[model samples]
Target: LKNTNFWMFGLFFFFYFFIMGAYFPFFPIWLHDINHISKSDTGIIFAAISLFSLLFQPLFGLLSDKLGLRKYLLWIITGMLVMFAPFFIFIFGPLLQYNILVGSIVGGIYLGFSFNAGCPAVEAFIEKVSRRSNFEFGRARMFGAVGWALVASIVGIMFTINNQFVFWLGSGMALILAVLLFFAKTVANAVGANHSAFSLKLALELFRQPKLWFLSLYVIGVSSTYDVFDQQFANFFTSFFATGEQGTRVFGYVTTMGELLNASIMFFAPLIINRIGGKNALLLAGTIMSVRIIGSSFATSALEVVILKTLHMFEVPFLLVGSFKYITSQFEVRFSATIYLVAFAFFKQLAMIFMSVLAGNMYESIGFQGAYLVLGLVALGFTLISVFTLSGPG
Candidate 1:
C-alpha cells in the first residue's frame, strides 16, 4: 500500500483504459454513422484487427517474457499511440473511402500493434510489479475501471459534438501515458531479478502442460462466447431506443454507471478471490455472464436491457482477477505474460474470430434472442465442465 510502484501502475491503467473507453464504444458508431461504412465492411475491418492482434499477441508475449523487460517495449508501443490521432484523423478515413481493403490492412496493423499487443505487456508488467510491491493486482486494476468509467461518461457527449473529439482525446490520453511512463519506476532492475534467463525451450515447455490446455478450454468456451455477445451489443442495445442518437447517449450513461460499480467491485475482488478461490471465482463469473446473456434474450424494454447489462459489471472483475490469480498460481512468473496472452487471451481471440462470424450468421437467420440463447447454453455447459477441469491453486 505504501509502495510507489502501486500508484504508478495504477496511473498507467487509468490513462490507458481512458483511451480505450473512447475507442471501444464509439469507434464502430463513427465508422457506421460518420464515415458511412457498411456493417459488413466494419465487421471486416474489425475482424482484420482481431486476426492481426491474435497473431501479434504470441510474438509480443514471447518477447516480453524473453526480454524480461517491459518499459522499453512499452516505449516503442507508446510511439504508436502518439501517432494514433494523425492516422485516424488524416490517413484512415481517406484510405477507407478509397479502398476498404487497404484501409483495413493499415488500420488493423496500427490498432493491433498499439492496443492489442500493448495491453498484454502493460497487464503483465503491472502484475509482476505487484508481487514485488506487496499489493493486490485487483486494487491497481480498479484504477483502469475508474478511468474507463470516467471516459464513458463524457465520450458520448464528445462523440455527439464531433466524432473526431474521441480520437483526439485518445491521443491526448496517450500523451499523458507517455509522460507517466517517463516518471514512474518499477522493480524491473531489482537485484536477483533474472527475467533475462527466460528461453525458447522454457516457452516450448509451456505447450506441453495439460493444465494450460485445460485453462485454454475454459477461455475458449466462456470468454470467447462473452466476447461474441459483446461485439454487436451496442447495436442490440440501441435497437431498444427510438433513435441511434438517444441510444448512444443512454448507453454512455449506463455503461459509465456500470463501470463505476465495476471499479468498486475490482477494488474488492482480491478479497472475494482470496476467500472463494480463483477457480470458484471464475466459475462464478461464468455463471453471471451466462445469466446476463440469457437474460438479455428475454428483455422486453430498454430498461430491462439496462438491468441485464448491469450484470456485466460484476462478471468482469471476477473474470479478470480470477484469471490473473489462476495464471500466477499455476505457472512461473516469467511465463505469466506468455501464458496469459497465449492460453487466456490468444484462445479467446482465436475462438472469437470464428465465433463472431458464426454468431453473426445466427443473428441474421435466427434473430438476436436465438443467438443469445445458443451462446448462453454453450457458456453454461462449459462453465459446468470447468468446475472439474480447472485446477485449484497448489
Candidate 2:
C-alpha cells in the first residue's frame, strides 16, 4: 500500500507542478504589464482571489465532506478554470489597450475569483491520499517547486523574445493539466466513517488552538514579505536601471534563479527536517529570511538582485512546508479542510490585503530602501517571536 501510494503520489506531483509552476511567478507580471494596472489594483486583484478562496474553499470543502464527492468537486473547479481562463486573455488583449475598465472587471472575475478554487480541493485530496505516510506532504509539494522552476526558467527566456505570448502559454498549460486531473483516480472517501460535523463553527474552532493562531500569524508576515517582492520587483529593477523591457527581463531571470534554488532546497528540506525537526528548521528558515531581506535592501546592481533573490529560496520551504505539516499533524482528519481554510486561506488573505494597500504606496513614498527596511524589521520580529513562542515540533 505504501509503495502504491508513492507511485500515485508521483502522478499527483506532476499535475500539481504543471499547473502552479506556470501560474505563480508569471501571473502577476502578466497582470501588471498586459493590463497596465496600478500596483494597488494588482493587489486588489490578488486580494479578491484570496478573499474568494477564504470564503468559498471552506464551503466547497464542507460540501465535499457532506456529499462524499471530493473528486467531483475537484473536477468541476478544474474544468471551469481550464475552459474559462483562456477567454479572459483573448477578451483583454496583449496590452489591454481596448478597455482597461472592462478588462479589469473581467480579468478580476476570471483569474482573481475563480482561479482560487483549486487550492483547497487539491490540499484536501492530498490529505485523503497520503494520511498513512508519516511525512510525504512536503515531498509531494516539492514537485511543484520543480515544475515552477522548469517552466519559469523557460518562460524567463521566452519573455526576452516576447512577453505577451508567455501569458497565453501559461493559460494553455493550465488547461492541459485540468484535463489530466479529470481522469485521476480517487484516493480516499472516509467521509461518514468517522465523520465530524462540518460547519463554520468547526472552522472557527481552529483559532482556539494557540499554536495554530501563532503559526497563521507567522505565515502572514512571511507572505507579505514575498508578495511585496513579487509585485514590485520588475518595477523596482526598471526604475533603478532605466532599461525598460531589459530590466523586466533581468527581473525574470532573478526570479527564475530564486525558483530554481527554492526547488533544490525543497527537495532536500524534508531530509533536514527529519534530523532537526520542523520547529528548528522553521527557526533556521526565519533567520535566513531576515538576512535575505536585509541583503535585498543593500542590493545595488542587477547581479546583486539575482544573488539576494536566490537567498530567499531558503525561507519558503522551511516556513510553508513546516506550517502545513504542523496543521495536518495537529488537526483531526475530518477537520483538515477547515484548518487549512483558516491557516492558508484566511491568513493569506489578510496578508494580501495589508501588502496591497501599503507596499505600492511605500515604494512611492520612501523608495526601495524604506520598503525593504520595513520588511527586514518584520522578518527579524517574526524570527524572535518564533524563537520565543514556538516549541518543539507538534
Candidate 3:
C-alpha cells in the first residue's frame, strides 16, 4: 500500500507539473503582449496573484485543518477551474475583440485569484505524500520541471503559428486535469497523533518560535532574489541587446535553455541530497547563485547571458525543496502543509512586492548589470548568514 501510494503521488505530481508549466510562464507573456501593458504593469499583475495567494492560503489551510477536509477541498478547488478556464479563453480571445475593458478585468480576475485557489491545497497534498521519505519531495517535484520544460520549448513554435490557440490549449489541458482530480481517491489524512486542536490562534503561536522566524526571514531574502530574476529576465535580455525580432528570439532561447537546465538539476537533486545532505546541498546552491548572479552582472553577449541563465538551474530546487523538508521536519505530519503554505505564501508575497516595486525601476535606470549586482550582494549576504547562523543535521 505504501508503494502504491508512492506511485499515485508521482502521478499527481506529473499532472501538477503539466498544468503549471502551461499556465505560469505563458500567462505573463500573454498578458503583456495581448493586453499591451507596460513592464511595471506586468510585474504588478503577476504580483497580484502572489498577493492573493498570500492573503488566502493560510485561511484555506486553517479551514482544511478545522474541517478535516483537505481532500474534498482539493476537489473543490480543481472544480472551480472549470468556471475560470472558459472565462480565460473568452477574455483572451473574444472579449478582446469586443471590449477591452471587460477583457482586462476578466483576464485579471482569472489570472490572479482563480488559479491560486488550488496552490495551498496542492502543497498540502504533496506534504501529505512526502511524509515517508522527505528526500523524495524533489524527486516527485521534478516532474513539474519536465512539464515546464516541455511547454516552454514548444510555446515559441505555438506563438509563431497562432498565439490565441496556445491559450485555448492551456485551458483545455487544465480542464482535463480538473476532471481527473475530481474522480481521484483521497489519501488518508495523517496529521500526527499529537496534533493540537486546529485554530488561527494555534497557527499564530507558531510565530513564537525564534527558529521559525529566522527561517521565514531567510526565505524572504532567498525568494525575493528568485522572483526578481524570474520576473525581469526577458526584459534584461531584450534591453541588453539591440531591439529587434532576433533579439526577442534570443531572449526566448536563453529562457528555454535556463528552464531546461533547471529541470535537469531538479531531476538529479534527490541523488545530490542523498550524497551531501540537504543543508550542504542548499549551501552549495546558494554559492552557485552568488556565482550566477555575479556572472550575469558582467555578461556581455547573448551567449554569455545564456550561460549565466543556465547556471540558475542550481539554485531553485535546492532552496525550494530544502525549505519544504526543513519545515516538515520541524512540524507534525498534519501541520506540515499548513505550516508550509503559511511560510511559502508569506515569503512569496514579500518577494513579489519587492520585485514589483524595485525590479523595473532598477532595471530601467541602472540596467541588468546593476540589478544583478544587487542580487549578487544579497546572495553573498545569505551565504554569510548560512555560514554563521545555520547548522543542522539533514
Candidate 4:
C-alpha cells in the first residue's frame, strides 16, 4: 500500500473491470434484445471467442513472459480495446444482423485480442509487481470488484434509457484505463533476472509437469463450469420478469449489491487463503460453485435467483487467490504469468468452447434448471477428485 506501484496496479484493476462491468452482464441482452441475435447464435459467437482465446492465450502468455512482464504489450492491447469498443454498436451488432459469421469473426478478433487476452496479462503483471513490492494480490485485485460494482450500480438505468449507452460508457472508461496504462511502470525484472532468458524452449518445459496438468484439470472442470453457467445466467434470470428491461434493471441492482460484497470479500481473501492452504481454499471455492449453480436450479422467482447469485462473492476470491498462491508456490515465479494464463485462463476457455455450445443447446431443450443441475454435478464431481489430485504448497 505504501508503494506508488501498488496504487497504480489497484487503479488499473479498478478501471479494467469498470469496462468489464459494462460489458459482461448486459452485452448478451444487447445481442439478444437490441441486436436480435438468438441464444444459439450468441452461444456460437461466445464459443468462437473462447476458441480464439484458447488458441491465442498461450502465445500471449509467452509473449508477456518473453517481454519480462513489461507495460508495453498491456498498453497496446488496452488501447486496441478502447478503439474497438464503439464498433460493437456501429459495426459488430449490425454485422450480426447481416450474417452471424461476419459478426462473430469481427467480435472474436476485437474481444479476443483485447479484453480476453489482456485480462490475464494484467493480472500476471500485477502479481509480479505485488511480489516485488510487498502487497497482497487480494488487496490490489479487490479494486476490480469495486470497479465492477460501481458501474453495475448505475448501468441498469443507463441501459434502460439507451442500450448503446453501456458500450459507449465502456469505451470512455477504457480510454481512461489506457491513459492510466501509459503512466504505470513495471518494477525491474527482478524475477526474470534471476532466471535464464524466457524462451519457447523454456516455456514448453512447463507442459511436462504433472502438477500443471492437475491445476488445469481443476480449472477445466470447476472454474469453466461456473463460467458456462454465468455466461447465460442474465438471460435465464431475466426470463422470470414481465419485460426484458425490467429484468435488466433488477439485475443491475442485484449485481450492484452482489459485487459490493465481492469487493469486500476479495479484500479479505488473502487472510482466508493464508489461514487455509491454497488447495483447501480452492476446494472450498469449488464447493461454493456447486452450491450456487445447483441451488439456482430451484429458484422460482428473481429473489431466489438473487440470493444464489450473491454466492459469487465468495467463490471468485477463493478461486483466484488460491490459484495465484498455488502457482507461485508450485512453479517458478518467473513463469507465474505463463502458467496462470495457460493453466487457468487458457484451460477454462478450452472447456468453455465445448460447454458454451452444449449449454446453449440445453437452455433451449432442457431449460435453465436442468442445465444448471447437470453442470453443478460436473463441478461437484471435479471438486471431489481434486481433493486427491492437487499438490500441496512448496
lDDT of each: 0.76, 0.62, 0.61, 0.76
- Count of residue pairs whose backbone atoms collide, per candidate: 0, 0, 1, 0
Q: What is the C-alpha lDDT profile of model 3 across 1-394, one tens digit per residue?
A: 2555555666666655555655666565555455555555555555655666676666666665566354766666556455444665654445544545433544564445545655655755666556644335656666555666666656655664576665566666557764664465543443332233444665677766566666665566666666666665655554455544454456456556777776667767777766766556667777876788777788888767766666676677787666655665555565554466556676657577656657656755676688788887886787768755445535
lDDT of 4 at 54: 78
- lDDT tens digits, residues 1-394, model 4? 4878777778888888888788778777777667777667767877877887777667766676667465677767676668655688776767788875644565555665566666776777777777787677757887677788888867876787876666777787778665865665653444332222345655578877777888888899888888888888887787787776778888888888877777678877899789898788889999999999889778798778777777887788888788878876778877764675566766788899899989887877788898888998998899898988854435
lDDT per residue for candidate 2 within 4-116, as digits (tens), equals 55555555566555555555666656656655666655555555555565667667666765673546676565655564435545664442445454345445545444446
Quality of model 1 by C-alpha lDDT: 0.76
Top candidate, metric TM-score: 4
What ranges in model 3 sit over 4 Å off?
1-16, 64-72, 83-89, 92-110, 113-117, 126-145, 180-209, 238-280, 324-342, 390-394
- Model 4 residue pairs with clashes: none
RMSD of each: 4.4, 5.2, 5.4, 4.2
Give all TM-scores, in the order shown. 0.81, 0.75, 0.73, 0.82
TM-score preference between candidates 2 and 3, better one: 2
User: What residue runs in model 1 are displaced by over 4 Å at the alpha carbon?
Assistant: 1-12, 65-70, 99-103, 125-144, 175-209, 327-338, 388-394
* Model 4 TM-score, all chains together: 0.82
Reference-based TM-score, model 1: 0.81
